[PDB]
Scaffold this active site. Sequence first.
Site, PDB file in Angstrom:
ATOM      1  N   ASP A 125      47.716 -69.286 -15.224  1.00  0.00           N
ATOM      2  CA  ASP A 125      47.365 -68.768 -14.607  1.00  0.00           C
ATOM      3  C   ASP A 125      48.517 -67.169 -14.322  1.00  0.00           C
ATOM      4  O   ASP A 125      47.969 -66.262 -13.489  1.00  0.00           O
ATOM      5  CB  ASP A 125      48.384 -70.105 -13.651  1.00  0.00           C
ATOM      6  CG  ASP A 125      48.138 -70.764 -12.767  1.00  0.00           C
ATOM      7  OD1 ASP A 125      46.965 -71.378 -12.893  1.00  0.00           O
ATOM      8  OD2 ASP A 125      48.780 -72.102 -13.011  1.00  0.00           O
ATOM      9  N   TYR A 126      49.492 -67.094 -14.962  1.00  0.00           N
ATOM     10  CA  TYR A 126      49.695 -66.309 -15.329  1.00  0.00           C
ATOM     11  C   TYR A 126      48.982 -64.750 -15.650  1.00  0.00           C
ATOM     12  O   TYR A 126      48.379 -64.056 -15.072  1.00  0.00           O
ATOM     13  CB  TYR A 126      50.880 -65.994 -16.146  1.00  0.00           C
ATOM     14  CG  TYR A 126      51.332 -64.457 -16.960  1.00  0.00           C
ATOM     15  CD1 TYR A 126      52.086 -64.186 -15.727  1.00  0.00           C
ATOM     16  CD2 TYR A 126      51.712 -64.290 -18.152  1.00  0.00           C
ATOM     17  CE1 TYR A 126      52.591 -63.040 -15.962  1.00  0.00           C
ATOM     18  CE2 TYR A 126      51.868 -62.715 -18.449  1.00  0.00           C
ATOM     19  CZ  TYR A 126      53.100 -62.302 -17.436  1.00  0.00           C
ATOM     20  OH  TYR A 126      53.560 -60.939 -18.066  1.00  0.00           O
TER      21      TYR A 126
END
Lengths: 219, 219
Positions: A125-126
């Site tokens: 996600d990052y």
Amino acid sequence: MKIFIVGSTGRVGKSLLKSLSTTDYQIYAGARKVEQVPQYNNVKAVHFDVDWTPEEMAKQLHGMDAIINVSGSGGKSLLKVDLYGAVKLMQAAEKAEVKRFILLSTIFSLQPEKWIGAGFDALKDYYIAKHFADLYLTKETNLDYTIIQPGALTEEEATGLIDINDEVSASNTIGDVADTIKELVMTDHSIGKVISMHNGKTAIKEALESLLEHHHHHH
Amino acid sequence: MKIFIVGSTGRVGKSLLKSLSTTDYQIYAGARKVEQVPQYNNVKAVHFDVDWTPEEMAKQLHGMDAIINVSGSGGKSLLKVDLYGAVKLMQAAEKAEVKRFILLSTIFSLQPEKWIGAGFDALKDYYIAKHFADLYLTKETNLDYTIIQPGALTEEEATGLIDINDEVSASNTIGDVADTIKELVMTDHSIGKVISMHNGKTAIKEALESLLEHHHHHH
């Protein structure tokens, strides 16, 4: 020069303020809560909120010579902060007519083909958030940008020694990331460039100097 | 024509399959679990995973005439599905040399200046994800695209009546969204266009026909 910092009160931001405190620059440290900005003789705290619109942000950026984004959400608000906040800041810089823009990103942020294994899986996600902000900077702005892409951040003491642009993901101290950013401010040949780093064997200044050999300026 | 559906097993996807089941098209319904695809005489279930790379996805898209993205994560995986998955699918379409691409987005997705009030506040993360995917489609692809931007989705029975491009956020039944998408497949003048909708007073076909008056084709 006059440098505006976004992410001032985060871990990298605080290291960067420490790093910049011993320069001849005038530092303008953006923060949601100005009282949280560490005090230094050459640092002025400025109210700044990542949730603001580009036009609201631009009001604080007038007359700045450079903008440095070291803002992150510690993985807790990736869409709002690491992606949208970062992009709005780029839009704000252009509105405020500030050209020089340095962005802290992450190793392989523009190479999804190298997001291999459990380490990248855990940070997927990052990675997506950072990827799209980097695409925006490199494709949808006219800024005099530099993207620095460190590996994993440690809180060990700075070594002063790094290596760059070697397609290696490895750790780097926060202090060395901050000091590399400090040097990038004075490295005009890094304009328009994406640079990867980790702790290594080469003094920061010398490492960046080694980029002159093959960097080409696009007229 | 041959149409590939991504998001087949989601709520809008299932409505779209129902809508398309009574056409002369050959439908290829992409799904992580093919057995979950509802059965229709003109629907073939195809293994497809949003987590795949563009190249992996492209293997399933060869020889398709159009691709429709009605994939969402119900707000539970916005970076991976609604943003990155959507963008990878666009990249896959180009690799597979499929030009026609219809994307389900949301009212005001390209107008952050209209994300006003508590309703948009609650859906801010969703809005950011959809915004960046729409920017990618409109700015970073060469696809023959249409973006449909409905208001809030309801499960009430389809009315057949909508209104479009009026800067209004209002509800629409899922069935009417599906039927509008079905009609867009046959609406060549919607190529390169972003269209907003809600339930209203105008038959879907007539509403889309009303766009011929002022749409201009970019040679």
